[PDB]
Amino acid sequence: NPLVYLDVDANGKPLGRVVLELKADVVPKTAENFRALCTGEKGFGYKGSTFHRVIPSFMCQAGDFTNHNGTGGKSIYGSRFPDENFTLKHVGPGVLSMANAGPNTNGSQFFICTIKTDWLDGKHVVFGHVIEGMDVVKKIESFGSKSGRTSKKIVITDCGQLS
Ligand SMILES: NCCOCCNC(=O)[C@@H]1CCNC(=O)CCC(=O)N2CCC[C@](Cc3ccccc3)(C2)C(=O)N[C@@H](Cc2ccc(-c3ccc(CCC(=O)O)cc3)cc2)C(=O)NCc2ccccc2CC(=O)N1
């Protein structure tokens, strides 16, 4: 399974690195989309974009590199793409899952859970998990709010593939 990284800052101050294992063994098409958006190999992707909605005791959401507000993004497949499967569950903190606007509306937006979000099982495609840097995720979460607006600008300053 590929390993990718997000290096995250808050108001320009580095918070550290999040390492994500992508479950290409279960959701290869969803894992590949995220991998390529981390490397930037198609000329666009996550680098320089933000965590735009962060809600404590819920999740940290990112990947809207077109509109920066939860309405946009772009997949590597030319259009919104189907839910590959709902095999993996939102079991706890550190789960990496696709944001969407209903069935079969996957793009580039994603979230990292900070609790078990079991009510999303069967609705959002889980495709990976944090293996290093959960403390960075908790730092991101600490800048969230009830509305999801962040108290500092949280940026993916760099991202890419490790292996
Ligand atoms: N329920 C029990 C108790 O739970 C309490 C905890 N709160 C919960 O469980 C809560 C409760 C319900 N609350 C909510 O849904 C919050 C919703 C919200 O913030 N927004 C703000 C932002 C825009 C809105 C409305 C919209 C959608 C679409 C376009 C324009 C406006 C609404 C929204 O929906 N945007 C989605 C992300 C999103 C992903 C992908 C795309 C997209 C895909 C493909 C392409 C082209 C690809 C190509 O061409 O290549 C382009 C775009 C667009 C939008 C959003 O944010 N979805 C919500 C969400 C995200 C992540 C995880 C979970 C959730 C559910 C949640 O948060 N649910």
Ligand 1 center–CA 61 separation, angstroms: 9
Ligand 1 lining (C-beta closer than 6 Å): 53, 58-59, 61, 70-75, 79-80, 99-101, 105, 107, 109, 111, 119-120, 124
Alpha carbon distance 94, 40 (integer Å)? 23
Nearest CA to ligand 1 atom 2: 119
Can you give the resolution of this entry in Å?
A: 1.3
Cite the beta strand spans of the chain per DSSP E: 3-10, 13-22, 51-55, 59-62, 95-98, 110-113, 126-132, 154-161
Residue 41: count other Cβ atoms within 10 Å of its Cβ.
13
State the distance from the centre of ligand 1 to the C-alpha of 77, rounded, in angstroms.
20
For 122, the token pair is 């069967």
Rounded CA gap, 5 and 163, in Å? 10
Identify the DSSP state of 119: G
Cα Rg of the chain (Å, integer): 14
